[PDB]
Structure formats: structure tokens, C-alpha cells
């Protein structure tokens, strides 16, 4: 399964909040305040045709800094895990 | 304008080599050897009438992964390495 562009509406925004909420448990940057997920947002669907889960890559502004966050999502349960959180990075 | 994922092929391979060739002029990572373009490759089309394009690539060179952004001018066809960051983790 491949990567595709997705929009930055409510579902993506809540992915962003998840990422920042998970990074705040780790503490690597000190306490971040979620601002917004910006374009572009990418999803990889991991797989007759049957979806197992997804991988999201997002650019998340928090505390007015840009970070790159990768999130895995389970298709059946919608359990969610923060795989990576990099930055600050410049915009794509 | 819009971002899109594009297929990996000869075009991306040449952008990858360009990035590494340009970064080697800068010198920030020493002499890098091009290895591979890894998925995905993203392109943005910028409108003014087309003004130009912007590429984001994940480029393996000297067995380290870097993120490279390349701009391309529609009228001149000139290309520039805007940045080359890393090592970064895989997408």
C-alpha cells in the first residue's frame, strides 16, 4: 500500500493533537501547545482488499514551531501510536 | 497550490542525484555518495499560469537519510536545492 495526500480537516487536526499530547508525555522538547496541522498531510494504507492499519505523516505547528510526526493507526480498533516526532523542521 | 505524490522512476532518480550533487558543493555533510530515493516523493505545483514546482524527497546518501526540497522554475527551467536536512528518520 502506498502513500497518498489527505486534507487537513478535523480528523487530521485531532491526529495532530494526539501527536502533541503523546510528545508531551515523553517531554523531549518541554511542554508543547498544539496549534494546527498544516498541509501537506500524507497517509499510507497498510493492507480481496482489506485494510489492516494506516501510517500518517503530518507537519504540526505547536508552540509556534514546526514538527514532523508519524502516527500509526489500527483499522479495526483505532488504537493509535506516535511512531516519530522530529523537529523543529522547516516547512515542506 | 496542490501537493501530490509522484511515482519513483528516472525523474526522481535525477532529482535525488541533483540534491546530493548540490549538497556536496555546500559541504555541510562532507562528501556524500548518492544511494537511493526512498518513497514517497511529493511535488507541489505553484501557480502565479504555472510559476514553478517544489519537490520534497527522501534521499539516502552515504547510508544516511536526508530530506531534500528542490524548487524548479517553470519559465527558465532552472532548479535549486532549497534545503537538505538530516539525518532524518524514515517517513
How many degrees, rounded to 5, is the angle at CA A68 between CA A67 and CA A69? 115
Query: What kind of experiment solved this structure?
Result: X-ray
**Any chain A CB within 8 A of the CB of B53?**
no
Q: Which residues of A touch B44 (CB under 8 A)?
A: 40
Buried residues in A49-88 as b, exposed as e (16+ CB within 10 A): eeeebbbbbbbbbbeeebbbbbbbbeeeeeebebebbebe
- In angstroms, this model's resolution equals 2.0
CA atoms within 13 A on the CB side of B59: 30
Q: How many CB pairs under 8 A join A and B?
A: 37
B66 near B87, Cβ under 8 Å?
A: yes
Helix (H) or strand (E) holding A81: strand A80-86
Is residue B41 a contact partner of residue B18, using CB atoms and an 8 Å limit? no
- Residues of B with CB below 8 A from A89's CB? 67, 85
State whether residue A88 sits within 8 Å of chain B by CB.
no
Q: Domain-by-domain residue ranges, chain B?
A: 1-91
A11 phi and psi angles, rounded to 5 deg: -60, -45
A70 lies within 8 A of chain B by CB = yes
Give the count of beta carbons closer than 10 Å to the beta carbon of residue B63: 10
Please state which CATH number belongs to domain A1-92: 3.10.450.10
Helix H or strand E encompassing B17: helix B10-26
Nearest-by-Cβ selection for B40 from A3, A39, A70: A3
Comparing CA positions, the residue from A57, A62, A63, A65 lying closest to residue A91 is A65
Chain-chain contact of A3 with B39 (C-beta, under 8 angstroms): yes
Q: What CATH number labels B1-91?
A: 3.10.450.10
DSSP state letters, B25-91 = HH-TTSS--EEEEEEEEEEEEEE--EEEEEEEEEEEETTEEEEEEEEEETTT--EEEEEEE-S----
Amino acid at each position: 500500500g502506498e502513500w497518498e495526500i489527505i486534507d487537513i480537516g478535523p480528523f487530521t487536526q485531532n491526529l495532530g493533537k494526539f501527536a502533541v499530547d503523546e510528545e508531551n508525555k515523553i517531554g523531549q522538547y518541554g511542554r508543547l501547545t498544539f496549534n494546527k496541522v498544516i498541509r501537506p498531510c500524507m497517509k499510507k494504507t497498510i493492507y480481496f482488499r482489506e485494510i489492516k492499519g494506516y501510517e500518517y505523516q503530518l507537519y504540526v505547528r505547536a508552540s509556534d514551531k514546526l514538527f514532523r510526526a508519524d502516527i500509526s493507526e489500527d483499522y479495526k480498533t483505532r488504537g493509535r501510536k506516535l511512531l516519530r516526532f522530529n523537529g523543529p523542521v522547516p516547512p515542506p
